[PDB]
């Protein structure tokens, strides 16, 4: 029922937070956290 | 508007003039409300209570009980003066006489003015 | 087969010999047919239609044979006649002897112990029957029985203390009371006992009701018979209370019983479903028990009188309080203590015993004996005292707080908005129209509510259809699976203004909102939505759909659950916005989005807001998702309601000689011209009479004396006495100038003496009512009255009001042939021009403009003929200067010379020879030439009189201001429809519209309230109505105003016109008695319905009315049509009645006539049902089609849609075979019998309609001729009576006819060939 990202049975396209629904081809290289900790800025 | 003023004077000369005057007051000021209350004192009662309700909503402040007094022409209008006093002096007593010392009433008026509180106590 | 076989054996009509009366038939039918079928409506209908009451029940009724079954059977029949709207009392009027015995025993039965000999349903039937009686006091036979139930002696049913209280209150009553007690002494013991029982009936009936009411459980199951008894009882209470003769003494009785307090505390009203109708009826009763009228004087109570009544009650309560109990309450000012809240505060804490004691001191209850406990509940005692003394808001304040739009809480409530399925078995919470009303407020409010609720029904149909088509589905949001022409999804909605209330009123003076729609639609629909204009009413709708996507809708199922209907609110278009944000040389907007600014009902807004603020209800105005528009012509309800409310608010100043008649009481003849104090002695009848012979013949009962003996000198003035002698003075029309063509047009109609009585009456002050049967010259009478008033009273203005624009076209057509200046004519309307000249505001402004040009040119020509220099053209202004300075001066000098004396000097000193060169004196005598000179001056003066009137067009540039001048000042005759009058009353009053005389046509086609409204299109003058005359012309024996939902007719008689009510009331009428448009033979089919309706000479004597119809032996026939392929009447869709056998026969006859050479256009085809209309059309196209030898009939339509219309030949199909249907309404019959000038041919199941008692005077004539069509296919100059010089063949059925026409046509296709392409 929700119709927004906020909120299988639904039988709707729903994308719940931010999974992209249109092509972007974005450059960004995935930020990563390892095990417990850190954004792997190295 | 000057023609409306002269016509208002013509209504002042006088039922139709009363209509022109009541329309002049209802046109949309507390002194003018006193004037319309004077019109209630002259012309004509529940409708006067309604216009008085309009004057009351316009300004809940102490002559309104006297405006209610026209409806008594009085114990009930004085009761309205009493309830208005609860909603806020001598006016309720005047309503009591209508149902039927001025110096102390005057010091009371000094109390009615909008160590000072101690004076209100004295 | 049982009831019908009995009917055939014992009482059925058209059966020569019957078995003798047998009481067991009555006993058996009642027990086994009526009671056992649970009073099945179809059984009761069959009995009633078979004439059970007229032919078996009543004429065999006597005291010796009277039984329960007998009494009940009579009441069932009478009740059913009311349900069917046919005359209910005729057989009792025929044999009145045993009615008093019968009536008294109805009373006994009604009071019979509950669940005793009579069941509760049976006693409900008796309640309804008695309701009909009280509603029928105009019938002497009924009134003479009911009098004793409702007169002053009924007060012996009062508590003794209350009686004394009333006699002290009205001391003059006691002597009448004493007189009653004295006359009672002169009675023998049984007559005394009977009198006392009658006097106590209503008060005892109330006690029976109260005990029935109390037997209703709060939550446990209840039998419907108890509910319905209580409902019908309140219906009876309302009617008794809403009629002054029944209210006068009974109102006190009802109050003494405390019925209303019992009812509001009852378990029944507390049952939300079971008691809902009871509650709504209760609210109506409450309105009347507290109605603002003096019971004894019959006058409406003023505001001061109301206040005094309320103050006196408190005062007497305080007196009792002070002396015996409540000390603080007793000493307080009235306003302190008189609110419901204050009263509960003061009396709520008291014990039951104390409250009983208080009530006893007010004579409301008997004394509570010392040390006894009261038997009454504390809540009863409290509510008794509180409701009696609390502040009440007035009827006007109550009205002014009513929203003008229906909400979802009203639209689907079938207690107040019944469907067309309403049988008439239960009652409705609706006002009733009959004869009388209490006051003007009562009268106006009944019409207000009936109009309000009836219009709500059409709204529901509009809503259910358009919203269903949109297919609202769940998506928790809404998605619309379909589209609708009349409704759009709302894209945005915002309240943009909530204005402050006027002083006193508690609602905003104005609420506005912006509503946006997206016109993503077909351009036709885009145009229609953009076609919305100011004052157009739309509805704002909230759906929260219940169904998943794709779910089918079923219109048979409850609409609200189907679409998830939550809210309905009305609104009124102010205007569409433009791209500059301005409320709308209209612009071309871009895109598909459109925003409208609208007005919301301020009372509805306040209630919703109050509900939100006080009770946490959601804001309705943030939820709308649909907006629906309507057809403009069906959507005037809000404006009419507003106008009526405004009329109610005003002092409603109608003529004092009209007020009582309007309310339906007092002398119905008191406004007749012979009883008006300002009756005019001498009248100029002008061109009314064609000769002195015509005049003498116009007054059969009078002696005519002429003021001049010379027969060559014999227009006429007539002086009436104040005694059978009329003084007639011939006079000469003043010469109008030297152009003989400027002599006036003249009336050519040789009016009958009856038509003359109408014209005479219309010229006099007062109320003139004219009953004009089909073709009796209503229109000629009307324009002659208008013309006579025009000439006799030049200052006076006449308002003409009709129902249709057709009638207006007819009036103006005939007006044009009379001596009436077209500058004095005006026609208002919101239309295809059908008259030779244009009398709209537009046409009249244009005439004035064009006439001004021509007249200013005449002034220029006059200037030059006088040798006055000046090249400038004249204006109306300088023309005026010219008249006084150049024209009047010359004339005055001239008159000074020749009128202060030879024939020669009349011409020698005549100042205007050159101007009239294009046209003078005869030189015979002074008197002649002088008058010729006078006429020349009148000619010139008329030019300048007109120019002075036309100056306004120089001072007012816009066509709208120019039209205002014509409406307010220039016109002397102003015409419009009653519809237009209702819509425009507000504007007309604001303009200062004035008029002296009203004439109406089609008066019996106009709704009651739409007849009343034209009386008040102006302000009072010096405190009185300016209205001098009211002329109404109509025919109550023809069809009534159209009520879309006939449930409002069945229960409320909402179709009844004011005209019809006045005739019923007994207002004297002038009954036109000579028709001039149809054969005398055809006239017989309906002239039985009227008073002495015969035929005019030209109908009697002209050849065109005695010439037979070619190929048909008879000029009219009723043709029996049995089954075709096993079917008679059919119903392919519900209520879409058809009859293939009849239709095919009718079409075949039409073809037969066309093949004979009839002018196809001179034939029209009529039927009583729309289903048959479409079927006949269907057959016309599928059988005639592309046939060169066969044209099309002028119309194929229903009888109801052919009112006021006619053709030479009418083919009529009655369709029905199972039941008679709405043709039983004799008015529909009369219209159906009178649409033909020369030929009427009717196709029906003859047996069905023969059995109908009301239709007998027509059908007994129709069956005097064969029921098989007599044709003469080889045929004209044959006359109506002469034996034909051809073969007469008899067609015995439709298939034989369809055969014949086929063969006839196939012979004509081979022998002829015509050629249209």
Curated annotation (Swiss-Prot), chain B:
HAT repeats lie at residues 74-104. Transmembrane segments: none annotated. It comes from the Eukaryota. Coiled coil: none annotated. It is found in: Nucleus. Belongs to the crooked-neck family. Associates with RNA polymerase II, the TCR-specific proteins CKN1/CSA and ERCC6/CSB, and XPA. Identified in the spliceosome C complex. Component of the XAB2 complex, a multimeric protein complex composed of XAB2, PRPF19, AQR, ZNF830, ISY1, and PPIE. Identified in a pentameric intron-binding (IB) complex composed of AQR, XAB2, ISY1, ZNF830 and PPIE that is incorporated into the spliceosome as a preassembled complex. The IB complex does not contain PRPF19. This is Pre-mRNA-splicing factor SYF1. The gene is XAB2.
Swiss-Prot record, chain C:
It catalyses: ATP + H2O = ADP + phosphate + H(+). The modification N6-acetyllysine is found at residue 990. The keyword Ligase does not apply. Residues 395-1317 are annotated as: Required for assembly of the IB complex. SUPFAM superfamilies: P-loop containing nucleoside triphosphate hydrolases. ATP binds at residues 750, 755, 775-780. GO terms for biological process: mRNA splicing, via spliceosome. Its EC number is 3.6.4.13. One of its GO terms (molecular function) is ATP binding. Keywords: Acetylation, ATP-binding, Helicase, Hydrolase, mRNA processing, mRNA splicing, Nucleotide-binding, Nucleus, RNA-binding, Spliceosome. Pfam families: AAA_11, AAA_12, Aquarius_N_1st, Aquarius_N_2nd, Aquarius_N_3rd. Identified in the spliceosome C complex. Component of the XAB2 complex, a multimeric protein complex composed of XAB2, PRPF19, AQR, ZNF830, ISY1, and PPIE. Identified in a pentameric intron-binding (IB) complex composed of AQR, XAB2, ISY1, ZNF830 and PPIE that is incorporated into the spliceosome as a preassembled complex. The IB complex does not contain PRPF19. Within the spliceosome, interacts with SNRPA1, SF3B1, SF3B3, SF3A1 and SF3A2. PANTHER family: DNA2/NAM7 HELICASE FAMILY, RNA HELICASE AQUARIUS. Involved in pre-mRNA splicing as component of the spliceosome. Intron-binding spliceosomal protein required to link pre-mRNA splicing and snoRNP (small nucleolar ribonucleoprotein) biogenesis. Plays a key role in position-dependent assembly of intron-encoded box C/D small snoRNP, splicing being required for snoRNP assembly. May act by helping the folding of the snoRNA sequence. Binds to intron of pre-mRNAs in a sequence-independent manner, contacting the region between snoRNA and the branchpoint of introns (40 nucleotides upstream of the branchpoint) during the late stages of splicing. This is RNA helicase aquarius. The lineage of its organism: Eukaryota, Metazoa, Chordata, Craniata, Vertebrata. The gene is AQR.
């Amino acid at each position: 029922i929700p119709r927004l990202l906020e909120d299988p049975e639904i039988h709707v396209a729903q994308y719940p937070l931010d999974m992209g629904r249109k092509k972007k081809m974005s450059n960004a290289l995935a930020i990563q956290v390892d095990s417990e900790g850190k954004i792997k800025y190295d | 508007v000057m023609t409306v003023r002269d016509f208002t004077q013509v209504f002042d000369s006088y039922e139709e003039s009363m209509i022109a005057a009541k329309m002049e007051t209802a046109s949309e000021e507390e002194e003018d409300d006193v004037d319309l209350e004077l019109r209630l004192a002259r012309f004509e009662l529940i409708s006067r209570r309604p216009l008085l309700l309009n004057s009351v909503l316009l300004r809940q402040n102490h002559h309104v009980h006297e405006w209610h007094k026209r409806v008594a022409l009085g114990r009930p209008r004085e009761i309205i003066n009493t309830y208005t006093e609860a909603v806020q002096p001598f006016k309720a007593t005047g309503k009591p006489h209508t149902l039927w010392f001025y110096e102390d009433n005057g010091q009371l008026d000094d109390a009615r003015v909008i160590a000072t509180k101690v004076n209100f106590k004295q | 087969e049982f009831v019908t076989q009995l009917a055939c054996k014992y009482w059925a009509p058209h059966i020569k010999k019957k078995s003798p009366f047998d009481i067991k038939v009555i006993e058996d039918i009642y027990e086994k047919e009526i009671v056992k079928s649970r009073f099945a409506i179809r059984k009761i209908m069959l009995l009633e239609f078979s004439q059970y009451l007229e032919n078996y029940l009543w004429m065999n009724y006597s005291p010796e044979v009277s039984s329960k079954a007998y009494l009940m059977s009579i009441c069932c029949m009478v009740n059913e006649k009311f349900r069917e709207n046919v005359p209910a009392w005729e057989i009792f009027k025929k044999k009145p002897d045993h009615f008093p015995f019968f009536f008294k025993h109805i009373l006994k039965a009604a009071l019979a112990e509950t669940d005793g000999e009579f069941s509760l349903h049976e006693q409900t039937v008796l309640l309804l029957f008695l309701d009909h009686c009280f509603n029928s006091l105009e019938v002497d036979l009924i009134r003479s029985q009911v009098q004793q139930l409702i007169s002053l002696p009924m007060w012996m049913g009062l508590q003794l203390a209350r009686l004394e209280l009333e006699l002290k209150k009205t001391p003059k009553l006691r002597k009448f009371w004493n007189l009653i007690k004295k006359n009672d002494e002169k009675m023998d013991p049984e007559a005394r006992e009977q009198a006392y029982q009658e006097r106590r009936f209503l008060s005892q009936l109330i006690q029976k009701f109260i005990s029935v009411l109390k037997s209703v459980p709060l939550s446990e199951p209840v039998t419907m018979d108890k509910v319905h008894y209580c409902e019908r009882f309140i219906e009876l209470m309302i009617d008794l209370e809403a009629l002054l003769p029944t209210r006068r003494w009974f109102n006190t009785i009802l109050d003494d019983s405390h019925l209303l307090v019992h009812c509001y505390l009852s378990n029944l009203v507390r049952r939300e479903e079971d008691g809902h109708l009871f509650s709504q009826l209760l609210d109506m009763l409450k309105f009347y028990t507290g109605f603002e009228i003096n019971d004894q004087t019959g006058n409406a109570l003023t505001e001061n009188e109301m206040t005094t009544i309320h103050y006196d009650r408190i005062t007497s309560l305080q007196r009792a309080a002070f002396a015996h109990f409540l000390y603080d309450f007793a000493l307080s000012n009235v306003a302190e203590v008189d609110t419901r809240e204050s009263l509960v505060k003061f009396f709520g804490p008291l014990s039951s015993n104390t409250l009983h004691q208080v009530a006893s001191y007010l004579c409301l209850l008997p004394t509570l004996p010392k040390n006894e406990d009261t038997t009454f509940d504390k809540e009863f005692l409290l509510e008794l005292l509180v409701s009696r003394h609390e502040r009440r808001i007035s009827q006007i304040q109550q009205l002014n707080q009513m929203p003008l739009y229906p909400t979802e809480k009203i639209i689907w409530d079938e207690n107040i908005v019944p469907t067309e399925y309403y049988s008439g078995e239960g009652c409705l919470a609706l006002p009733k129209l009959n004869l009388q009303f209490l006051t003007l407020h009562d009268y106006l409010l009944r019409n207000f509510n009936l109009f309000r609720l009836e219009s709500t029904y059409e709204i529901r149909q509009d809503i259910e259809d358009s919203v269903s088509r949109m297919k609202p589905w769940q998506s928790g949001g809404v998605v619309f699976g379909g589209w609708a022409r009349m409704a759009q999804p709302i894209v945005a909605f915002t309240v943009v203004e909530v204005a402050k209330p006027n002083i006193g009123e508690n609602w905003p003076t104005r609420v506005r909102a912006d509503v946006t729609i997206n016109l993503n639609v077909r351009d036709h629909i885009k145009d229609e939505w953009e076609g919305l204009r100011k004052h157009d009413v739309c509805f704002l709708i909230t759906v929260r759909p219940t169904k998943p996507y794709g779910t089918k809708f079923d219109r048979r199922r409850p609409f609200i659950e189907q679409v998830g209907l939550v809210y309905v609110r009305g609104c009124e278009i102010q205007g569409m916005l433009d791209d500059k944000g301005r409320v709308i040389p209209r612009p071309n907007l871009r895109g598909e989005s459109r925003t409208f600014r609208v007005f919301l009902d301020p009372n509805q807004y306040q209630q919703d807001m109050t509900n939100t603020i006080q009770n946490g209800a959601e804001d309705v105005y943030e939820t709308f998702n649909i907006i629906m528009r309507r057809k403009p012509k069906e959507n005037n309800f809000k404006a009419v309601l507003e106008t009526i409310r405004n009329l109610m608010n005003t002092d409603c100043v109608v003529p004092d000689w009209l007020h009582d008649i309007i309310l339906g009481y007092g002398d119905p003849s008191s406004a007749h011209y012979s009883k008006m104090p300002n009756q005019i002695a001498t009248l100029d009848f002008n061109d009314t009479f064609l000769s002195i012979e015509h005049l003498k013949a116009s007054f059969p009962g009078h002696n005519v004396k002429v003021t001049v003996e010379d027969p060559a000198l014999q227009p006429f003035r007539i002086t009436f006495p104040v005694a059978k002698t009329l003084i007639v003075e011939p006079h000469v029309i003043p010469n109008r100038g030297p152009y003989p063509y400027n002599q006036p047009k003249r009336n050519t109609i040789q009016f009958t003496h009856t038509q003359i009585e109408a014209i005479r009456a219309g010229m006099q002050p007062g109320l003139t009512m004219v009953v004009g049967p089909p073709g009796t010259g209503k229109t000629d009478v009307a324009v002659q009255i208008i013309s006579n008033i025009y000439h006799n009273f030049p200052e006076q203005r006449t308002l003409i009001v009709t129902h249709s624009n057709q009638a207006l076209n007819q009036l103006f057509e005939k007006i044009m042939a009379l001596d009436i200046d077209e500058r004095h004519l005006l026609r208002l309307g919101h239309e295809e021009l059908e008259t030779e000249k244009d009398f709209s505001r537009y046409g009249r402004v244009n005439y004035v403009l064009a006439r001004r040009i021509e007249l200013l040119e005449e002034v220029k020509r006059l200037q030059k003929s006088l040798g006055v220099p000046g090249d400038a053209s004249y204006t109306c202004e300088t023309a005026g200067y010219f008249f006084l300075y150049q024209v009047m001066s010359r004339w005055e000098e001239y008159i000074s010379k020749v009128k202060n004396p030879d024939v020669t000097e009349v011409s020698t000193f005549f100042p205007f020879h050159e101007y009239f060169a294009n046209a003078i004196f005869k030189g015979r005598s002074y008197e002649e030439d002088m008058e010729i000179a006078e006429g020349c001056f009148r000619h010139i003066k008329k030019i300048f009189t007109q120019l002075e009137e036309f100056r306004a067009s120089e001072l007012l540039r816009s066509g709208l201001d120019r039209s205002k001048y014509l409406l307010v000042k220039e016109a002397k005759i102003i015409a419009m429809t009653c519809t237009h009058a209702a819509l425009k009353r507000h504007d007309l009053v604001k303009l200062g519209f004035k008029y002296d005389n009203i004439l109406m046509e089609e008066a019996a086609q106009i709704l009651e309230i739409e007849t009343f409204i034209p009386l008040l299109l102006q302000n009072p003058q010096d405190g009185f109505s300016r209205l001098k005359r009211w002329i109404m012309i109509g025919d109550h024996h023809q069809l009534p105003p159209v009520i879309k939902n006939m449930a409002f007719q069945k229960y409320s008689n909402m179709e009844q016109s004011l005209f019809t009510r006045f005739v019923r009331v007994g207002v004297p009428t002038v009954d036109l008695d000579a028709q001039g448009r149809a054969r005398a033979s055809l006239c017989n089919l309906y002239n039985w319905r009227y008073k002495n309706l015969g035929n005019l000479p030209h109908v009697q004597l002209l050849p065109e009315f005695s010439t037979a119809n070619a190929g048909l032996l008879y000029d009219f026939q009723l043709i029996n049509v049995e089954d075709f392929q096993g079917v008679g009447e059919s119903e392919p869709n519900p209520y879409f009645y058809q009859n293939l056998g009849e239709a095919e026969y009718v079409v075949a006859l039409f073809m037969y006539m066309c093949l004979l050479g009839y002018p196809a256009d001179k034939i029209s085809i009529l039927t009583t049902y729309n289903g048959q209309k479409h079927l006949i059309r269907d057959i016309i196209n599928r059988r005639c089609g592309n046939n060169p030898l066969i044209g099309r009939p002028n119309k194929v339509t229903t009888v109801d849609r052919f009112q006021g219309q006619q053709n030479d030949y009418i083919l009529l199909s009655l369709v029905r075979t199972r039941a008679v249907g709405h043709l039983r309404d004799v008015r529909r019959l009369v219209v159906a019998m009178s649409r033909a000038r020369l030929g009427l041919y009717i196709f029906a199941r003859v047996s069905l309609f023969q059995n109908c008692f009301e239709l007998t005077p027509a059908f007994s004539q129709l069956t005097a001729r064969p029921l098989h069509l007599h044709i003469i296919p080889t045929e004209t100059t044959r006359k109506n009576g002469e034996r034909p010089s051809h073969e007469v063949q008899i067609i015995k059925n439709m298939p034989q006819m369809a055969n014949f026409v086929y063969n006839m046509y196939m012979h004509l296709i081979q022998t002829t060939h015509h050629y249209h392409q």
